[PDB]
């Protein structure tokens, strides 16, 4: 009842406009909502609970497939029920092929500790940040993302370096990073996207955030990230991606081409142009697809990793059956 | 003349024994002076006779030290000058157009040789005058070995700009250390590294500026040892590479047309004689010249301006004759 109306409000907020802007807020709200779902709805066996979770997660994902934090948090919860059921009652590999009613409290405590560990991902990333920045380095970022801004603005407490931020047109939110970071004395620079390659030779390394990392190591980021990665590969400069663990989602690029997110073309082309708006077709995607071959490293709350290892993290977070959801 | 033969013998002995003169510019000037004396203080009637004499002297000088090409380049330039003078005094390139369309010489040749010396004199300043347009403030420039042309280039550039220079010593002949002091005497904030570390530091280098010993026809280079590795690292990081090379260093030969392209010296520098027993089985090689393919070269800078490697064939065609690549 009350939980149902809260779920409906959450779905409507996702459909219209994200209230809690930070992805961490999305993860915390999704986990809390799943907590009241588990506590309130009645179930005898784990199967009906799993299918109810499948239905609710399907509804929430269908509300807005552009962002996948809700989806992979739901998948993590489903794996939590699977693990708890296997523990209280009793991974695909060649070894497997050759060889061969009180869990509610355990589920609740698992979700609680998941929230506790999710709280400190930013702090862990900041703690390990200092080992990848040396004095008088040149760093370039794209758009706005709180992870990398915390990264740099804490790693500059003991080091001095230069930072270049390219505005992510049309949503010129790189200016926000520039202002916030220059309010910490970092000697930053504000730049357009069209100049990326023009300056890319004189950059030591490039650190970027992301919105979602796929299974193959390819990621979905803000528009223009693919061009930056291509320039990096051309100049062979290392590329660092700062992404917490919950931004890892088990889908794959070729899925119905509902991958990008197209917004109103008002930002790209103002409505004041007039007559020419009929014969002209305008596209304003907000996300770009970066292949895994252009990525050098992954920094998460657990440490450093290579893209070629990303698949393993998939097996430790999501059961293969719950990919389709 | 007796003194002409004396000077020829002294020159060939100096070339074949060791170094001298110190700078390739001085060697080219001495070769041009010797050739001028040969042309003046000798008897000859037909242009063919003079060309045969010049060819014999050039063959002898090249056989004295094949690894040194400046003498051969000067001889071929003199031969081309003789050909042009005879052609435009008697009559009036090997192109498709030519395919489809079928007494006072000595003074003119001497005047042309004097013009060649005059433009040789100011080659270093001609190269260094355009340094300011290739360096920006707070740049990082990496250099290998020892080269007076690059030294003058960087000194001229540093007059009105500030940047950092990283020099890799060219082991075993660690002549880069001279850079290490010389640029330091100009206050350019230089750093010294062993030449085992190029790639390790290479990612932090904005541009690489190097000299060379010889430029081949296809656009390749004969440089100091390890320059091939530096060029490979530059190509890997796609950092632009600059070859400060005067005009007189364009040999019309080709890389694999011959051997002894590398020059081998005593292995004492690499491995000292004090090792003793292990030297009795160990084979040691100390090549002092390395081959740089033209693919890894981004730009050539000469006393006439900048050029791409793909255009080198034209310049080599504008200074020599195809029938003189055999000498």
Swiss-Prot record, chain A:
GO biological process, one term: regulation of translational initiation
Cell compartments where the protein resides: Cytoplasm, Cytosol
Gene3D superfamilies, per the entry: Translation initiation factor eif-2b, domain 2
Regulation: Activated by the chemical integrated stress response (ISR) inhibitor ISRIB which stimulates guanine nucleotide exchange factor activity for both phosphorylated and unphosphorylated eIF2.
Xref: InterPro entries: eIF2B_beta_subunit (IPR051855), IF-2B-related (IPR000649), IF_2B-like_C (IPR042529), NagB/RpiA_transferase-like (IPR037171)
GO cellular component, one term: cytosol
SUPFAM superfamilies assigned: NagB/RpiA/CoA transferase-like (SSF100950)
Recorded GO MF terms: ATP binding; GTP binding; guanyl-nucleotide exchange factor activity; translation initiation factor activity
Keyword hit for Cell division: no
Keyword Protein biosynthesis listed: yes
Function (record text): Acts as a component of the translation initiation factor 2B (eIF2B) complex, which catalyzes the exchange of GDP for GTP on eukaryotic initiation factor 2 (eIF2) gamma subunit. Its guanine nucleotide exchange factor activity is repressed when bound to eIF2 complex phosphorylated on the alpha subunit, thereby limiting the amount of methionyl-initiator methionine tRNA available to the ribosome and consequently global translation is repressed.
Quaternary data: Component of the translation initiation factor 2B (eIF2B) complex which is a heterodecamer of two sets of five different subunits: alpha, beta, gamma, delta and epsilon. Subunits alpha, beta and delta comprise a regulatory subcomplex and subunits epsilon and gamma comprise a catalytic subcomplex. Within the complex, the hexameric regulatory complex resides at the center, with the two heterodimeric catalytic subcomplexes bound on opposite sides.
Disorder noted: Leukoencephalopathy with vanishing white matter 2: An autosomal recessive brain disease characterized by neurological features including progressive cerebellar ataxia, spasticity, and cognitive deficits. Brain imaging shows abnormal white matter that vanishes over time and is replaced by cerebrospinal fluid. Disease severity ranges from fatal infantile forms to adult forms without neurological deterioration. The disease is progressive with, in most individuals, additional episodes of rapid deterioration following febrile infections or minor head trauma.
Protein family membership: Belongs to the eIF-2B alpha/beta/delta subunits family.
Protein known as: Translation initiation factor eIF2B subunit beta
Organism: Homo sapiens
Lineage of the species this protein comes from: Eukaryota, Metazoa, Chordata, Craniata, Vertebrata
Swiss-Prot record, chain B:
SUPFAM superfamilies tied to this protein: NagB/RpiA/CoA transferase-like
Pfam families: IF-2B (PF01008)
Means of activity regulation: Activated by the chemical integrated stress response (ISR) inhibitor ISRIB which stimulates guanine nucleotide exchange factor activity for both phosphorylated and unphosphorylated eIF2.
Keywords assigned by UniProt, alphabetized: Cytoplasm, Disease variant, Initiation factor, Leukodystrophy, Protein biosynthesis
Subcellular location: Cytoplasm, Cytosol
The organism's place on the tree of life at top rank: Eukaryota
A GO term, aspect molecular function: guanyl-nucleotide exchange factor activity
Chief subcellular location: cytoplasm
GO process terms (BP): central nervous system development; cytoplasmic translational initiation; myelination; oligodendrocyte development; ovarian follicle development; regulation of translational initiation; response to glucose; response to heat
GO annotation, cellular component aspect: cytoplasm; cytosol; eukaryotic translation initiation factor 2B complex
InterPro entries: eIF2B_beta_subunit (IPR051855), IF-2B-related (IPR000649), IF_2B-like_C (IPR042529), NagB/RpiA_transferase-like (IPR037171)
Family note: Belongs to the eIF-2B alpha/beta/delta subunits family.
Function, in words: Acts as a component of the translation initiation factor 2B (eIF2B) complex, which catalyzes the exchange of GDP for GTP on eukaryotic initiation factor 2 (eIF2) gamma subunit. Its guanine nucleotide exchange factor activity is repressed when bound to eIF2 complex phosphorylated on the alpha subunit, thereby limiting the amount of methionyl-initiator methionine tRNA available to the ribosome and consequently global translation is repressed.
Medical condition linked: Leukoencephalopathy with vanishing white matter 2: An autosomal recessive brain disease characterized by neurological features including progressive cerebellar ataxia, spasticity, and cognitive deficits. Brain imaging shows abnormal white matter that vanishes over time and is replaced by cerebrospinal fluid. Disease severity ranges from fatal infantile forms to adult forms without neurological deterioration. The disease is progressive with, in most individuals, additional episodes of rapid deterioration following febrile infections or minor head trauma.
Assembly notes: Component of the translation initiation factor 2B (eIF2B) complex which is a heterodecamer of two sets of five different subunits: alpha, beta, gamma, delta and epsilon. Subunits alpha, beta and delta comprise a regulatory subcomplex and subunits epsilon and gamma comprise a catalytic subcomplex. Within the complex, the hexameric regulatory complex resides at the center, with the two heterodimeric catalytic subcomplexes bound on opposite sides.
Protein name: Translation initiation factor eIF2B subunit beta
Gene source species: Homo sapiens
Gene that encodes the chain: EIF2B2
């Amino acid at each position: 009842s009350e939980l149902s109306e809260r779920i409906e409000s959450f779905v409507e907020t996702l459909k219209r406009g994200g209230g809690p802007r930070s992805s961490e807020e999305m993860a915390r709200e999704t986990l809390g909502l799943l907590r009241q779902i588990i506590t309130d709805h009645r179930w005898s066996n784990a199967g009906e609970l799993m299918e109810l979770i499948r239905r609710e997660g399907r509804r929430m994902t269908a509300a807005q497939p552009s962002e996948t934090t809700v989806g992979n948090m739901v998948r993590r919860v489903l794996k939590i029920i699977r693990e708890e059921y296997g523990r209280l009652h009793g991974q695909e590999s060649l070894h497997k092929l050759l060889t061969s009613a009180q869990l509610q409290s355990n589920i609740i405590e698992a979700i609680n500790e998941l929230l506790v560990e999710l709280e400190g991902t930013m702090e862990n990333i900041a703690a390990q940040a200092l080992e990848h920045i040396h004095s008088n380095e040149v760093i370039m970022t794209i758009g706005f993302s709180r992870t990398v801004e915390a990264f740099l603005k804490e790693a500059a407490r003991k080091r001095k370096f230069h930072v270049i931020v390219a505005e992510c047109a049309p949503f010129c939110q790189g200016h926000e990073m520039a202002v916030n970071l220059s309010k910490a004395g970092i000697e930053t620079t504000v730049m357009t996207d069209a100049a990326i390659f023009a300056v890319m030779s004189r950059v030591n390394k490039v650190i970027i955030g992301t919105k979602t990392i796929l299974a193959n190591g390819a990621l979905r980021a803000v528009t223009g990230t693919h061009t930056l990665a291509l320039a990096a590969k051309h100049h062979s400069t290392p590329l660092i991606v700062c992404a917490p663990m919950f931004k890892l989602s088990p889908q794959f690029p070729n899925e119905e081409d509902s991958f990008h997110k197209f917004v109103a073309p008002e930002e790209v082309l103002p409505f004041t142009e007039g007559d020419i708006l009929e014969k002209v077709s305008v596209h304003c995607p907000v996300f770009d697809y970066v292949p895994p071959e252009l990525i050098t490293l992954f920094i998460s709350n657990i440490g450093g990793n290579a893209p070629s290892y990303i698949y393993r993290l998939m097996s430790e977070l999501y059961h293969p059956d719950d990919h389709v959801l």
